[model samples]
Target chain A: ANTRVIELFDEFTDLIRDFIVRHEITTPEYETIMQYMISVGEAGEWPLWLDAFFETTVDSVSYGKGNWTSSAIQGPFFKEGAPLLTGKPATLPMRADEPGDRMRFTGSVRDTSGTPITGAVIDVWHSTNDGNYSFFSPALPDQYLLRGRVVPAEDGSIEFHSIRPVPYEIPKAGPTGQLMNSYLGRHSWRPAHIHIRITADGYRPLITQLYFEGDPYLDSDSCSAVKSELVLPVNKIDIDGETWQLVDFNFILQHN
Target chain B: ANTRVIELFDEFTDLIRDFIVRHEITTPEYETIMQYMISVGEAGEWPLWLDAFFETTVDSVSYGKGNWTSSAIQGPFFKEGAPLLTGKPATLPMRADEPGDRMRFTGSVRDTSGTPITGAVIDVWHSTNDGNYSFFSPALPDQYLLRGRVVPAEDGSIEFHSIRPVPYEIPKAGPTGQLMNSYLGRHSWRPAHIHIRITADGYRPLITQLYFEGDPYLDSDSCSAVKSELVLPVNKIDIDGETWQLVDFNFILQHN
Candidate 1:
């Protein structure tokens, strides 16, 4: 199987090379990018963001009842040992000084048959209002703001409160950044979105992201992780003088 | 300009990725091939043969006349500092016990304008009867067999006696070999041919291969190095009781 895999890959590589040569697209400039990819690959620094864009499946598939929302690419920001929390309405920190509209997100986890999946772990994370992930921000705590892992209640429902995510630029100094600026002719920005990883016993794992309805980068997301079904409706809410939004999302997992 | 180049490359990369994703072609198998290319590029072990093939331009503009046969790829068999010899008819060696048809090859070196290129050093080399190159063959001397550098006479002509090159399989034990067998689904054989590298004062250096006309691999050269003009006419000759084939090849160099 390994040998056959190698053979199949070589066949593809040749076809691509011929396309390049036939189209007269083999320029030194092109070679530079090829070398850059090889260098990044050799250094084991392939950007998870780009890999995500490469591996994501957003098209229709008949895996579930009708059309199942396909899994998104796992970005590189995930780290093991995220502190676990349990509560009816778990509130995550927002880096006290950062400013953004307060938001509360509620979600339920269920099996494809519509049965509640109690005790399932819902790992949720998002960048701060300033577009910086807590773990990656130097000024924040080692496990700082806007990340939480919650166990769904007996009804398979979970909730977390934090600042709404804002559109942010991908790191621009690396190969991926260069590719974005040079080849894509656009900024390396992703729309406001929240990442979720769900795990439950006897169920297939599902990783996905929920994008805001009106974010400018939704259609042009640098990570290409957004899908029509994954876009959540944002509802405006008012309490005293503070303005907030509420997002409700539900996930259906397939049995293993 | 450099920035624009980078941008163009990124654009191309993105398009290719979209194509891959659209076709559901992204896989661990595909990723393996990508990583292999990156590894090859990082190691800087790009075969000289392919490099030559990539660099060659068989068509001509105003640089020379109608067309000076474009050069071919230099396979991995070359060694620096082949022993230099000066004579009207220099005789190269064929290992005493090596098995193959003995042949004499003669050639001239001249400027594109048809002037003799005097003092040009014509370096020549080829594999043994069994398709093993001198430097690469474990059983052969380090640099002992089938390699020589001869200075052409004032008439810009030289001659050498050696075994005629025969079709031989490329090394099939490495990454390159795997690509040939598995990806290409074809034998890694190159047609009978001899390598020549010429250097002369006031002329651009030229490196090319002289291929046999009737060799079966010409049309399907593994390296894509064959050109119509570089295919020399083969003539059968009889001297006393010895039978041999004579190849008459001429090379034209461009002004530096």
Candidate 2:
């Protein structure tokens, strides 16, 4: 790993040298970006910015090669200690009148050999109706809304009740936004996604994102993690007197 | 310029993506570096690290193509407001009987058109005998040492007396050290150099470094800024029954 890292450093710095020669970036110009980088570092935005921009590139190299579940950028919004749901078809934590479509997301976890994964658990999180994540966005309730852990039944099937996640701009009022919007002149929109991590003993843990079929940002996702296999549709279902949005998906873990 | 910056960033990140895919860097591996990057950023080492490593590449692209005096990385220890020297062949600020070779370095500033540049000022600095820079080095006197502004004569000739700059290790007690020595497994030595910035009206400022002939680190300077045109020899000279180490060099400025 040390040799690999050294090789990469040499190669990357060589590319920059080539880049400077090609573009003729002068001291003042290079110094400008140096200051910007310093600001990003000082603001503690390197992790946030890289996770927002390059995590998917790393994830792309890491996953989806085998029949294992495809992985996506876990992104920067994930937090620890999401409350565990109590039942098979559990409802995620949210306000009683959460301002989004109530959706029943159904899924199952299994290994590549087609055997149901026993004692499987899924840690899931997503944005609320305002397109804001818990513990990040202002004005959200103190509780962890729209985030929880779900244990699949013996058959490996599970369902969760939560609001449909929506596309949201990455935090833009900081150095990352300046680099993305002002410096790079690019947008910060990521397609809405459900962040999910499925795990079971004796199997590889799979972390992935599920996108709605109609999320407008899919093709133009800023993070470069829009996998077709992870995109699903929300269908209208009439359960008794009320109509509900429903999504069906499944998880596949790789053999460890 | 915005377009140029965008193009470089895109190219650079594409190289990283390619590197990841080529090396098959996994999630944990990538995350390890991400955390390291966060540490470097949090510790405010981006500018220090980049200037120590990549500024030379940028400087290479920025200078020495047409003999307007070669440029070198200014490095990270420059400070503002060096006191102006008193007279021709001015002696730089240092304690009486400073602990290094009393080098009489003489130079001249001229335009590329062979004209003597009038009113040229040189801001010059170098390390003490202990391979430590003034202001940054510990246990130094309160006043600036081996640092001052020397105005060239009407004929564009300039002279100064100061300690010989010695080969020194870049500051390695921080996150940058962790990345360079621990992670990348590389040394941190920079060749001994006297940093000079010459400026005049109607001419481009030229910032360069001068190296002595026998410095060991010249072949393996960690900063990657060694240029043949910027290297000089420390010859011997006798004056007033005292021997002095003498270095003679010249500077050229380009039309603004």
Candidate 3:
């Protein structure tokens, strides 16, 4: 299966190359567009933008036995050994002075059989109010703020706290900027979204992103990582005189 | 003609994107390939490499009414305003102790009508013996070496003395490197070649590279800039106890 899959992809690339030649697409401007599109992926920064341009729904495909969550591109920012926190109701470290509204995210991990999967690990992260991740933040802090890991309860659910994400722009100040803003004349913004990776002992590992509705860039996310089913509606509520945003989502993992 | 050409190219790009989706080629690895190919073009570093991979000869096409020389990719290293020297014979700057063999390059500039182009300017440049261009070199002299411009003699001939070019590697330390070395697992070295840009009054300008025969990398140039007709054969000679490599080439420009 592995070798055949590799051969198939090679053939596909060759086909694309052939098409490029046959169409006489031999200009520097076109090459500029191709370079920027690919550099974004190599940086592991924004694979979704490429997908959106290609009109491919990354989350629409399935692999393996279970009704698995479709995988999104693993960006360069993902680091191994994200701190694992125990318990069903763990809270991520956050500063009260952070600029965005505090929010609670509730979600459950379930097997394809509709049974909640106990002890499923949920690793979640998103950009801060300043539109930066912890590692990418220049002066925020030395530690992870808007990222953490949690273990689901016996009922197959978990809840965590984080700042509500705002719409953010992908990097547009380098070669990428030259392509997106100069040559293509396109914006580099993406709608507000949170990235999640779920894992368990006997199920296929799932990686996906959850997006919010009504965000201006939702309809035109630069990364094209958004899926209609993944766009959750947020509820505004006052908890102890502090306004908070609330969202609930579920994970469905396929059996290996 | 101009507006229609623009619209046609736009449609071509859009069709390519549509094909990307129809084939479901949404993997990050594929994105990496595409990005590298395009970035090489944008960097003006390696058009020949792309063309070779696609099995297309960029110089095989003609534009306008005349059989003008096909333009090669003008890489980032090219700079304008080269000083024009007036002598029938001029020599490019070369250190007495430089590592490569000293050589004389003789060439001619003419219109497709076979008339010699008097006063035509021939701008030329190539890498140093160390396989580095002047601008991209770390600590070379501020002045350009192995580069200069000269007007052809009344007979349409030009001559200059410089070091013979050797096979040199493209940059392997950045995105281009990642695409060339890591992702593509291909060597970044190009065959020895000399870049020449020719221009004269009442004729279209020509940008092309003169290549040497019997170069191992000729068949695998990282920039895909090679053409069979551009390959000039060399003769080894000893004059006045000094060794010299000699070659001659001709340029044909189209009338406006």
Q: Estimate, for each residue in A72-117, the C-alpha lDDT of model 2 and write its tens digit.
A: 8888778888898976569898887888777888878888888888
Fnat per model, in the order shown: 0.07, 0.79, 0.05
Tens-place lDDT per residue, model 3, B1-256, is 2443345445655665554555555455455644654465455545334444442332333232236565665555676776666554588766667778888888788888898998578888888877887766665775777778878887988888888999987667755555457656677888988888888888777777888989999899776767777788999889899989999987888877
Top model number, lDDT: 2
lDDT of 1 by residue, B1-256 (tens): 2655555455556666655654455445456645656555554445432443343332111123334545665665788988876565566655666687778887788887988888689889998878888877666878657889877677887778788889877667555655666655766777888988888878877777898887999897766667787888889889899899898877788887
Candidate 3 ranges beyond 4 A from true positions: A1-66, A70-90, A97-104, A128-132, A161-166, A169-189, A213-218, A233-246, B1-77, B81-89, B97-102, B128-132, B138-142, B163-191, B212-222, B233-246
lDDT of 2 by residue, B1-256 (tens): 5687688788878877777788787878877887877777777577878887789888877765667787778888887899999765578898888786678887788887777887798999998878777787567865688889988789978888887778887667787776667777777888888999877887777788898788888888877889877789788777655568889987888876
Over all chains combined, what TM-score does candidate 3 have? 0.73
The CAPRI category of model 2 is: medium
Q: Tell me the lDDT of model 2 at A144.
A: 81
Ranking by TM-score: 2, 3, 1
Q: TM-score winner between 1 and 2, please give it.
A: 2
